[PDB]
Design a protein around this motif. Sequence first.
Motif, PDB file in Angstrom:
ATOM      1  N   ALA A 185       0.849  -1.214   0.000  1.00  0.00           N
ATOM      2  CA  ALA A 185       0.000   0.000   0.000  1.00  0.00           C
ATOM      3  C   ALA A 185       0.882   1.261   0.000  1.00  0.00           C
ATOM      4  O   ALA A 185       0.532   2.260  -0.622  1.00  0.00           O
ATOM      5  CB  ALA A 185      -0.941  -0.003   1.237  1.00  0.00           C
ATOM      6  N   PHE A 186       2.046   1.191   0.680  1.00  0.00           N
ATOM      7  CA  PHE A 186       2.987   2.305   0.767  1.00  0.00           C
ATOM      8  C   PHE A 186       3.657   2.573  -0.576  1.00  0.00           C
ATOM      9  O   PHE A 186       3.747   3.703  -0.998  1.00  0.00           O
ATOM     10  CB  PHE A 186       4.044   2.056   1.835  1.00  0.00           C
ATOM     11  N   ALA A 187       4.087   1.529  -1.255  1.00  0.00           N
ATOM     12  CA  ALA A 187       4.694   1.671  -2.576  1.00  0.00           C
ATOM     13  C   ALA A 187       3.643   2.079  -3.596  1.00  0.00           C
ATOM     14  O   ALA A 187       3.928   2.897  -4.493  1.00  0.00           O
ATOM     15  CB  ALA A 187       5.354   0.385  -2.964  1.00  0.00           C
ATOM     16  N   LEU A 188       2.422   1.537  -3.454  1.00  0.00           N
ATOM     17  CA  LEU A 188       1.321   2.043  -4.254  1.00  0.00           C
ATOM     18  C   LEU A 188       1.166   3.561  -4.030  1.00  0.00           C
ATOM     19  O   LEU A 188       0.986   4.302  -4.984  1.00  0.00           O
ATOM     20  CB  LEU A 188       0.031   1.287  -3.982  1.00  0.00           C
ATOM     21  N   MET A 230      -0.156   3.956   8.974  1.00  0.00           N
ATOM     22  CA  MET A 230      -0.236   2.811   8.067  1.00  0.00           C
ATOM     23  C   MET A 230      -0.901   1.570   8.719  1.00  0.00           C
ATOM     24  O   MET A 230      -1.460   0.734   8.005  1.00  0.00           O
ATOM     25  CB  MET A 230       1.130   2.432   7.511  1.00  0.00           C
ATOM     26  N   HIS A 231      -0.842   1.454  10.043  1.00  0.00           N
ATOM     27  CA  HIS A 231      -1.548   0.381  10.740  1.00  0.00           C
ATOM     28  C   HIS A 231      -3.052   0.473  10.556  1.00  0.00           C
ATOM     29  O   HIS A 231      -3.727  -0.529  10.449  1.00  0.00           O
ATOM     30  CB  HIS A 231      -1.323   0.436  12.244  1.00  0.00           C
ATOM     31  N   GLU A 232      -3.574   1.683  10.636  1.00  0.00           N
ATOM     32  CA  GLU A 232      -4.983   1.932  10.409  1.00  0.00           C
ATOM     33  C   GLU A 232      -5.389   1.724   8.943  1.00  0.00           C
ATOM     34  O   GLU A 232      -6.437   1.192   8.691  1.00  0.00           O
ATOM     35  CB  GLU A 232      -5.347   3.313  10.863  1.00  0.00           C
ATOM     36  N   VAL A 233      -4.561   2.154   7.999  1.00  0.00           N
ATOM     37  CA  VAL A 233      -4.768   1.881   6.580  1.00  0.00           C
ATOM     38  C   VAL A 233      -4.883   0.366   6.363  1.00  0.00           C
ATOM     39  O   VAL A 233      -5.857  -0.116   5.810  1.00  0.00           O
ATOM     40  CB  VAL A 233      -3.615   2.472   5.723  1.00  0.00           C
ATOM     41  N   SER A 289       1.597   6.514  -6.875  1.00  0.00           N
ATOM     42  CA  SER A 289       0.435   7.377  -7.210  1.00  0.00           C
ATOM     43  C   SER A 289       0.838   8.844  -7.067  1.00  0.00           C
ATOM     44  O   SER A 289       0.503   9.676  -7.889  1.00  0.00           O
ATOM     45  CB  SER A 289      -0.761   7.060  -6.293  1.00  0.00           C
ATOM     46  N   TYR A 290       1.567   9.141  -5.995  1.00  0.00           N
ATOM     47  CA  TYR A 290       2.148  10.461  -5.746  1.00  0.00           C
ATOM     48  C   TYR A 290       3.058  10.883  -6.909  1.00  0.00           C
ATOM     49  O   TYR A 290       2.955  11.954  -7.421  1.00  0.00           O
ATOM     50  CB  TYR A 290       2.952  10.392  -4.440  1.00  0.00           C
ATOM     51  N   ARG A 291       3.917   9.988  -7.340  1.00  0.00           N
ATOM     52  CA  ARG A 291       4.970  10.315  -8.274  1.00  0.00           C
ATOM     53  C   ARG A 291       4.500  10.385  -9.720  1.00  0.00           C
ATOM     54  O   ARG A 291       4.866  11.294 -10.457  1.00  0.00           O
ATOM     55  CB  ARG A 291       6.082   9.273  -8.144  1.00  0.00           C
ATOM     56  N   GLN A 292       3.700   9.414 -10.124  1.00  0.00           N
ATOM     57  CA  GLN A 292       3.183   9.336 -11.491  1.00  0.00           C
ATOM     58  C   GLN A 292       2.043  10.310 -11.790  1.00  0.00           C
ATOM     59  O   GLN A 292       1.932  10.761 -12.926  1.00  0.00           O
ATOM     60  CB  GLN A 292       2.737   7.906 -11.792  1.00  0.00           C
ATOM     61  N   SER A 293       1.228  10.657 -10.783  1.00  0.00           N
ATOM     62  CA  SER A 293       0.009  11.446 -11.015  1.00  0.00           C
ATOM     63  C   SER A 293      -0.204  12.567 -10.031  1.00  0.00           C
ATOM     64  O   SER A 293      -1.338  13.032  -9.890  1.00  0.00           O
ATOM     65  CB  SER A 293      -1.230  10.551 -10.915  1.00  0.00           C
ATOM     66  N   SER A 294       0.856  12.980  -9.346  1.00  0.00           N
ATOM     67  CA  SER A 294       0.771  13.950  -8.253  1.00  0.00           C
ATOM     68  C   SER A 294      -0.341  13.626  -7.240  1.00  0.00           C
ATOM     69  O   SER A 294      -1.018  14.508  -6.717  1.00  0.00           O
ATOM     70  CB  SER A 294       0.632  15.364  -8.820  1.00  0.00           C
ATOM     71  N   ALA A 295      -0.520  12.344  -6.989  1.00  0.00           N
ATOM     72  CA  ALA A 295      -1.514  11.852  -6.032  1.00  0.00           C
ATOM     73  C   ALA A 295      -2.976  12.031  -6.490  1.00  0.00           C
ATOM     74  O   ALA A 295      -3.896  11.842  -5.678  1.00  0.00           O
ATOM     75  CB  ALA A 295      -1.295  12.461  -4.650  1.00  0.00           C
ATOM     76  N   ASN A 296      -3.181  12.321  -7.777  1.00  0.00           N
ATOM     77  CA  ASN A 296      -4.508  12.460  -8.333  1.00  0.00           C
ATOM     78  C   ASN A 296      -5.247  11.101  -8.518  1.00  0.00           C
ATOM     79  O   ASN A 296      -6.477  11.043  -8.400  1.00  0.00           O
ATOM     80  CB  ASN A 296      -4.428  13.202  -9.673  1.00  0.00           C
ATOM     81  N   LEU A 297      -4.494  10.036  -8.810  1.00  0.00           N
ATOM     82  CA  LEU A 297      -5.020   8.758  -9.295  1.00  0.00           C
ATOM     83  C   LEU A 297      -4.266   7.596  -8.663  1.00  0.00           C
ATOM     84  O   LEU A 297      -3.050   7.705  -8.368  1.00  0.00           O
ATOM     85  CB  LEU A 297      -4.782   8.645 -10.803  1.00  0.00           C
ATOM     86  N   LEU A 298      -4.959   6.467  -8.508  1.00  0.00           N
ATOM     87  CA  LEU A 298      -4.357   5.275  -7.923  1.00  0.00           C
ATOM     88  C   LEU A 298      -3.685   4.513  -9.024  1.00  0.00           C
ATOM     89  O   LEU A 298      -4.332   3.980  -9.897  1.00  0.00           O
ATOM     90  CB  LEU A 298      -5.383   4.364  -7.257  1.00  0.00           C
ATOM     91  N   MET A 354      -6.309   3.744   0.172  1.00  0.00           N
ATOM     92  CA  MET A 354      -4.989   3.750  -0.484  1.00  0.00           C
ATOM     93  C   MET A 354      -4.579   5.136  -0.977  1.00  0.00           C
ATOM     94  O   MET A 354      -3.399   5.465  -1.065  1.00  0.00           O
ATOM     95  CB  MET A 354      -5.009   2.748  -1.632  1.00  0.00           C
ATOM     96  N   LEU A 355      -5.579   5.938  -1.295  1.00  0.00           N
ATOM     97  CA  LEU A 355      -5.388   7.281  -1.848  1.00  0.00           C
ATOM     98  C   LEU A 355      -4.986   8.229  -0.724  1.00  0.00           C
ATOM     99  O   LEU A 355      -4.264   9.188  -0.929  1.00  0.00           O
ATOM    100  CB  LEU A 355      -6.682   7.737  -2.490  1.00  0.00           C
ATOM    101  N   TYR A 356      -5.458   7.928   0.480  1.00  0.00           N
ATOM    102  CA  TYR A 356      -4.942   8.565   1.691  1.00  0.00           C
ATOM    103  C   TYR A 356      -3.390   8.473   1.829  1.00  0.00           C
ATOM    104  O   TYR A 356      -2.743   9.469   2.132  1.00  0.00           O
ATOM    105  CB  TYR A 356      -5.657   7.988   2.926  1.00  0.00           C
ATOM    106  N   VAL A 357      -2.787   7.323   1.558  1.00  0.00           N
ATOM    107  CA  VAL A 357      -1.331   7.181   1.649  1.00  0.00           C
ATOM    108  C   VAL A 357      -0.646   8.123   0.648  1.00  0.00           C
ATOM    109  O   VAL A 357       0.316   8.827   0.963  1.00  0.00           O
ATOM    110  CB  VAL A 357      -0.813   5.768   1.350  1.00  0.00           C
ATOM    111  N   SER A 358      -1.166   8.135  -0.557  1.00  0.00           N
ATOM    112  CA  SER A 358      -0.625   8.983  -1.629  1.00  0.00           C
ATOM    113  C   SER A 358      -0.684  10.491  -1.326  1.00  0.00           C
ATOM    114  O   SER A 358       0.231  11.277  -1.613  1.00  0.00           O
ATOM    115  CB  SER A 358      -1.438   8.744  -2.913  1.00  0.00           C
TER     116      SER A 358
END
Length: 239
Positions: free
Chosen positions: A76-79, A196-199, A83-92, A117-121
């Motif tokens: 979920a963290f690497a996801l 991340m435990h809650e995620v 998502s952050y890097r490829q889409s500025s956190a716009n998309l999963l 998952m989008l919360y992590v991003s």
Amino acid sequence: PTLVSLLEVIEPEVLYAGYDSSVPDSTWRIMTTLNMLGGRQVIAAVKWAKAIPGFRNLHLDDQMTLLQYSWMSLMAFALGWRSYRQSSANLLCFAPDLIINEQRMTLPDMYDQCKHMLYVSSELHRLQVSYEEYLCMKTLLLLSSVPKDGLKSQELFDEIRMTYIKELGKAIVKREGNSSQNWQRFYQLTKLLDSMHEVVENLLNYCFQTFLDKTMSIEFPEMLAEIITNNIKKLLFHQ
Ligand SMILES: CC#C[C@]1(O)CC[C@H]2[C@@H]3CCC4=CC(=O)CCC4=C3[C@@H](c3ccc(N(C)C)cc3)C[C@@]21C
């Protein structure tokens, strides 16, 4: 060689999902594809972990216990990072060929799963986490739960977790601050790790497999034994 440079070298390549967009989307098609991709990512997480310095000198029981408790967190963290890097956190961004856009998100059950998952991003985006910070953070997720009754080599485990905590520290200092801001940032990043435990808690409530899938996987005698046959300390930086 520095320790983060070694983390950079063993960082897994990004896998394709093998989704084809030539069919209209369905929840079934996406979840089925994600099942296959998720199995593959687990295999790649184990292979990554086995090359983590320190960790790799724990008995296999300890290594497998740590992985058991942390594989969902790591994926979920690497996801989140992708998502952050490829889409500025716009998309999963599960995979270069499997991106959950605004429309796929209105598919049955997508929003509910994806919002976690989008919360992590979006946190990686809000904190503007650097790559070196991310590498150290991700190693700490491997070391974020232990059995209540302790590992076989708990003392070694302590040493290893402390070395990656200090490595996180070095990544924050390099990135930058005038003292107050190093500690603030350390606070913020270790709060994200805690969260991340809650995620993962939310993500574990979803369907692992169906009855058809289960039926095809197992011989009946073994399922019977399972039926007859009918703890974890979450390490927290903050209470
Ligand atoms: C949309 C959606 C969704 C989910 O059902 C919840 C979290 C996803 C998980 C996160 C972590 C994760 C990150 C990805 O890159 C997509 C792969 C992935 C998943 C999906 C998954 C499916 C099967 C397994 N097994 C069999 C080992 C592991 C992961 C699907 C998950 C569970």
